[PDB]
Amino acid sequence: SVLTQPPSVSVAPGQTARITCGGNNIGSKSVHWNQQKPGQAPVLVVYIPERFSGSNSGNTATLTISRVEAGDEADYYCQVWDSSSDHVVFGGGTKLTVLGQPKGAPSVTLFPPSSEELQANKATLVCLISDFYPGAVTVAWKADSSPVKAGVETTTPSKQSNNKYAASSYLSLTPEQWKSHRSYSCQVTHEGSTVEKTVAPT
Amino acid sequence: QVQLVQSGAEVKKPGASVKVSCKASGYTFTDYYINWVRQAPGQGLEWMGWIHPNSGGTNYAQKFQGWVTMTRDTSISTAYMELSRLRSDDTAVYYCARGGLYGMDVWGQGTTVTVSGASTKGPSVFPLAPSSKSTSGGTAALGCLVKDYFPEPVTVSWNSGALTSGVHTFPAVLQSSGLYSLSSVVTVPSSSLGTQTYICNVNHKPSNTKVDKRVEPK
């Protein structure tokens, strides 16, 4: 048995979310639903509020969440028991995103290499991006308006404690590379708008 | 209180083996199946198998047959699972969910198994000096670069835990060399520099290293 779910579903606060789970005659095989918030273990629902209700019929099972809150942002997995093998089969999982959170522009702080690191014949540019929503960012680096992509390491966006997102981008280069250019720039774009910070060896 | 408590994180090399235990509490260990599930970083849930603690019999998914071994010790109400000849793919979080004798209720907190060819390495801590550009409207931004360490995690405090407001420590980047790097910045009033001392305390227990770097202005 295979279990197919929509990969993502989005809903406004207070609205009703519906997450489907498709399978071969799933309407007669007893379906269970799991909820997993980021960083935690899965938690069984299968109906924790009465806003969660289940409905299994035909070839699709459906978890319905009424009056959605931001606390409901999680990953949801359906789960059935393949009696052909005495195995447990999980669904692909659905990402529930709530569309009520306030948008935010990225705040960027760029640090030149330390003198101590330069004395070790090393040099790193540190670009710290914070307080942006939604959590999607593109980072670009420039050496005197010439794009640079070697030595670039960037983190994927990670949600902060204030329910916004943060990332960081690092540019690895040599001291003779750092002092050979007039300046370097870390450009961060987010929903069309861009913020740029420049740093120079002087 | 029904609980499932698993062993701590493990950092292994390719070709090595690992054993993870699952402790059962708040219920008779031997009238509920014990299932195991693997979740790769950013992927979904993948059932690995079950074992019933009464007779000790097992049932594995085909993908995990041959290198996964599930046992149990009914005396201490503990289930075990042994991964043999580890691969980089096997890097994942491993859970030990409880199953009905029809429940499939209650999960463990999970054990992280990180498989990599990188070797344990303490970090080089460099200060991120304030000065201009770091200052914006009377507030200065000083940081600490914690470069080239393996494996996770590091802990960064400021002034031995006395400086907590304005602290933003960033999740670590995994460079292509296999080592980690993160940064920890604090926003302090620009008038505080000169009269106040700022030290970042970086603790990296896997390497038994702790570095207090004084961050001074340019």
Residue numbers in the entry:
A (entry chain L): 2 to 48, 57 to 211
B (entry chain H): 1 to 101, 111 to 227
What does the study report here?
Specifically, we examine the influence of epistasis on the evolution of a well-characterized RBS-directed bnAb, CH65, which binds and neutralizes diverse H1 strains. The affinity-matured CH65 has 18 mutations throughout the light (VL) and heavy (VH) variable regions, which improve affinity to strains that circulated early in the donor’s life and confer affinity to antigenically drifted strains. The structural changes upon affinity maturation of CH65 and clonally related antibodies have been extensively characterized. This work showed that CH65 primarily matures by preconfiguring the HCDR3 loop into its binding conformation, thereby minimizing the conformational entropic cost of binding. Importantly, none of the 18 somatic mutations are in the HCDR3; rather, key mutations in HCDR1, HCDR2, and LCDR1 result in contacts that stabilize the HCDR3 loop in its binding-compatible conformation.
Previous studies on this lineage showed that HCDR3 rigidification contributed to high-affinity binding to SI06: crystal structures of the unbound, affinity-matured Fabs had the same HCDR3 configurations as those in the antigen-bound state; the UCA and I-2, however, were either disordered or constrained, due to crystal packing, in a binding-incompatible state. To determine whether the mutations Y35N and H35N could stabilize a binding-compatible HCDR3 conformation, we determined X-ray crystal structures of unbound Fabs containing Y35N in the UCA background or Y35N and H35N in the I-2 background and compared them to previously determined structures. These variants were insufficient to rigidify the HCDR3 as observed by the HCDR3 conformation and high B factors or the lack of density corresponding to the HCDR3. Similarly, although the I-2 with the mutations Y35N and H35N confer affinity to SI06, the HCDR3 lacked sufficient density and also had high B factors (bottom middle). In examining the minimally mutated variants that can bind SI06, we find that Y35N in the light chain and H35N in the heavy chain interact synergistically with the I-2 mutations (G31D, M34I, N52H) to confer affinity to SI06 (bottom). The somatic mutation Y35N effectively removes these interactions with the HCDR3. Similarly, H35N removes a methionine–aromatic interaction, known to have a stabilizing effect in proteins, between the HFWR2 and HCDR3. However, the addition of H35N into the I-2 background produced weak but detectable affinity with an association rate that was improved upon addition of Y35N. The I-2 mutations (e.g., G31D, M34I, N52H) may compensate for the G189E mutation by stabilizing interactions with HA opposite this site, potentially allowing the antibody to shift to relieve the clash; a similar observation was made for another RBS-directed antibody.
